[PDB]
Amino acid sequence: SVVGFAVDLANVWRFPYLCYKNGGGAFLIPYTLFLIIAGMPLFYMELALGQYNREGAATVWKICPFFKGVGYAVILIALYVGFYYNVIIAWSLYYLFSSFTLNLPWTDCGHTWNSPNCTDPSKYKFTPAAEFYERGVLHLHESSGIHDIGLPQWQLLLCLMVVVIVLYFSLWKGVKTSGKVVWITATLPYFVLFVLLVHGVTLPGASNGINAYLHIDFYRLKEATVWIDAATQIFFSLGAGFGVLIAFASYNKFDNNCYRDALLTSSINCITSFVSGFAIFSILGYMAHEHKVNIEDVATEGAGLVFILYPEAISTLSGSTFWAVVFFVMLLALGLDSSMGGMEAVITGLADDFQVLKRHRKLFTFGVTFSTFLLALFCITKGGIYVLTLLDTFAAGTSILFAVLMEAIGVSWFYGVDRFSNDIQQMMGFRPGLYWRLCWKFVSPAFLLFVVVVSIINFKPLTYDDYIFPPWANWVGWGIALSSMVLVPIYVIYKFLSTQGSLWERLAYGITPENEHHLVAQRDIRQFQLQHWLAI
Ligand SMILES: *[C@@H]1O[C@H](CO)[C@@H](O)[C@H](O)[C@H]1NC(C)=O
Numbered sequence: 001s002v003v004g005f006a007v008d009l010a011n012v013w014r015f016p017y018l019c020y021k022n023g024g025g026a027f028l029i030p031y032t033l034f035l036i037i038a039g040m041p042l043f044y045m046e047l048a049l050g051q052y053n054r055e056g057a058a059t060v061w062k063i064c065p066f067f068k069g070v071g072y073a074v075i076l077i078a079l080y081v082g083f084y085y086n087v088i089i090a091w092s093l094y095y096l097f098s099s100f101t102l103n104l105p106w107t108d109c110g111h112t113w114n115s116p117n118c119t120d121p122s123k124y125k126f127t128p129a130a131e132f133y134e135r136g137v138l139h140l141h142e143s144s145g146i147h148d149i150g151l152p153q154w155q156l157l158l159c160l161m162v163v164v165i166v167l168y169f170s171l172w173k174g175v176k177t178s179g180k181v182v183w184i185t186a187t188l189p190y191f192v193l194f195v196l197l198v199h200g201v202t203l204p205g206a207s208n209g210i211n212a213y214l215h216i217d218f219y220r221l222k223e224a225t226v227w228i229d230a231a232t233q234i235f236f237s238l239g240a241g242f243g244v245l246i247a248f249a250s251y252n253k254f255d256n257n258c259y260r261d262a263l264l265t266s267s268i269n270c271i272t273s274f275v276s277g278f279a280i281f282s283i284l285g286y287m288a289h290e291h292k293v294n295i296e297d298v299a300t301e302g303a304g305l306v307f308i309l310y311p312e313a314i315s316t317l318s319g320s321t322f323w324a325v326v327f328f329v330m331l332l333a334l335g336l337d338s339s340m341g342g343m344e345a346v347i348t349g350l351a352d353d354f355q356v357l358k359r360h361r362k363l364f365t366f367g368v369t370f371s372t373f374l375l376a377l378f379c380i381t382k383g384g385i386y387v388l389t390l391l392d393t394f395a396a397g398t399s400i401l402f403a404v405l406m407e408a409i410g411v412s413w414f415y416g417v418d419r420f421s422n423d424i425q426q427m428m429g430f431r432p433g434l435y436w437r438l439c440w441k442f443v444s445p446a447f448l449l450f451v452v453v454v455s456i457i458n459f460k461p462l463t464y465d466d467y468i469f470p471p472w473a474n475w476v477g478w479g480i481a482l483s484s485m486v487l488v489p490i491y492v493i494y495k496f497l498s499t500q501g502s503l504w505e506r507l508a509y510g511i512t513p514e515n516e517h518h519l520v521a522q523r524d525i526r527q528f529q530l531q532h533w534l535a536i
């Protein structure tokens with residue numbers, strides 16, 4: 001039961017700047033509400049589906065052939081996310097390489113990458129840590145926008161090559177490869193978080209940050225942005241909507257208890273996210289005190305917030321080299337575990353559909369890894385931060401919400417929630433209670449539909465700190481988002497057009513499970529009765 005205790009890289013990297021962007025404490029209410037309402041029930045649903053059917057994301061829809069486009073959509077979303085997930089790991093490797101010294105590079109203002117405006121004690125970017133991150137690592141000062149991105153840096157190129165080589169050699173021989181990664185992933189982050197929290201509570205000015213964190217702006221609610229952000233982050237962090245959970249549960253024992261796993265994972269997620277936010281806001285308060293600025297303008301709101309905040313707190317400890325090495329090793333391990341999970345999801349989902357790919361695992365693994373490396377080459381250019389921001393905004397947003405809603409609607413309305421409950425009782429010995437059935441059938445779909453409609457209606461053009469993207473970038477992002485959403489109606493049209501018979505016959509074939517198709521000739525379909533749809 002050590003997989004349940006494993007910490008996610010999302011809770012440590014993405015949650016801080018999403019909480020800081022939305023004012024602090026106002027972000028916690030929609031997050032908890034969505035976790036209770038739609039997060040845990042659908043985690044449970046995906047685990048149970050994968051465990052019962054022993055299939056991947058694509059071939060699990062043999063229970064309802066019309067809904068097979070959702071698996072392709074989630075596989076495409078996983079590929080899109082993996083296209084930029086590994087740049088964070090490359091950054092962590094670069095920082096770990098830079099940490100092997102007694103004079104950390106982010107503490108002084110006397111190096112070759114420092115502008116004459118760098119100050120050693122809108123947005124504030126003249127601090128040594130921010131200057132290091134933006135000029136000695138990204139080299140962003142040589143880029144003018146998404147229209148001018150330049151050539152990739154060779155140091156980040158070497159880091160990316162190392163990352164992809166490790167990823168390939170950790171997957172080329174199959175699943176269950178003696179996953180010692182989860183042992184580090186379940187122990188070290190707790191120690192690091194405890195040490196950082198205990199130290200940061202005592203820093204001068206941290207009280208203001210804690211007060212800001214524990215304050216709720218009720219005007220920040222009633223607007224769409226915080227709800228959309230919380231809903232997207234819940235499913236991003238829990239792993240739902242990527243095909244990871246179904247693929248991993250397809251290897252579980254038949255009588256494994258998915259209820260306990262769902263409960264434990266949800267609790268760990270909540271606790272880790274809250275602690276991470278507390279530590280981040282303590283550091284923010286200290287930084288605002290020391291630089292003599294407001295807390296709303298002291299740091300950036302992008303994907304590189306932790307890479308500035310955490311070295312700043314590390315520099316305040318005694319024995320900074322040891323703590324820096326430990327922290328960046330932990331970050332690297334978290335990233336590697338997440339990337340392994342995503343790659344395995346893609347590979348298993350695609351290999352279950354085509355049986356020829358099962359005899360050529362090494363070649364298929366090489367193809368997937370090389371394609372990911374070639375596509376990730378775009379995000380290590382001089383202006384790669386803009387490409388990364390675009391991908392992080394448009395890869396798993398409305399698309400992932402729509403895919404999750406389609407999965408829930410399919411399972412709970414066309415296959416049958418009572419059939420699902422009977423399937424669970426067959427392998428676990430007990431039947432799910434009324435709360436789970438109600439959440440599966442009515443509560444979660446309604447909230448997901450509302451959030452999808454609101455996200456479409458209230459779209460805001462993309463920005464990065466003080467930089468405003470051109471409109472064609474927004475068009476490109478919306479095209480990326482739609483490329484995964486269009487796959488479901490396309491497959492429905494193809495399945496209807498590729499079946500021979502009459503309208504009634506094709507309609508009956510599209511909704512009947514593949515192993516019950518002998519009932520079409522007998523003309524007895526449960527979906528053609530009122531009791532099937534009235535059943536709750
Ligand atoms: C520093 O600030 C001045 C404005 O006072 C600006 O003209 C100059 O370009 C800045 N230098 C850099 C590279 O940060």
Ligand SMILES: [NH3+]C[C@H](O)c1ccc(O)c(O)c1
Pocket residue numbers: 020021022023024212295296297
């Ligand atoms: N722009 C930062 C965000 O709006 C924010 C962060 C901390 C605060 O105390 C705040 O009022 C707002």
Ligand SMILES: [NH3+]C[C@H](O)c1ccc(O)c(O)c1
Pocket residue numbers: 010077078079081082083085236239242244338339341342343
């Ligand atoms: N385990 C989910 C995580 O967010 C993740 C990481 C890398 C991926 O390629 C992916 O599809 C999912």
Ligand SMILES: [Cl-]
Pocket residue numbers: 010011015233237273
């Ligand atoms: Cl989170």
Ligand code: NA
Pocket residue numbers: 006007008009185334335337338
């Ligand atoms: Na992890």
Ligand code: NA
Pocket residue numbers: 008011237238265268269
């Ligand atoms: Na989690």
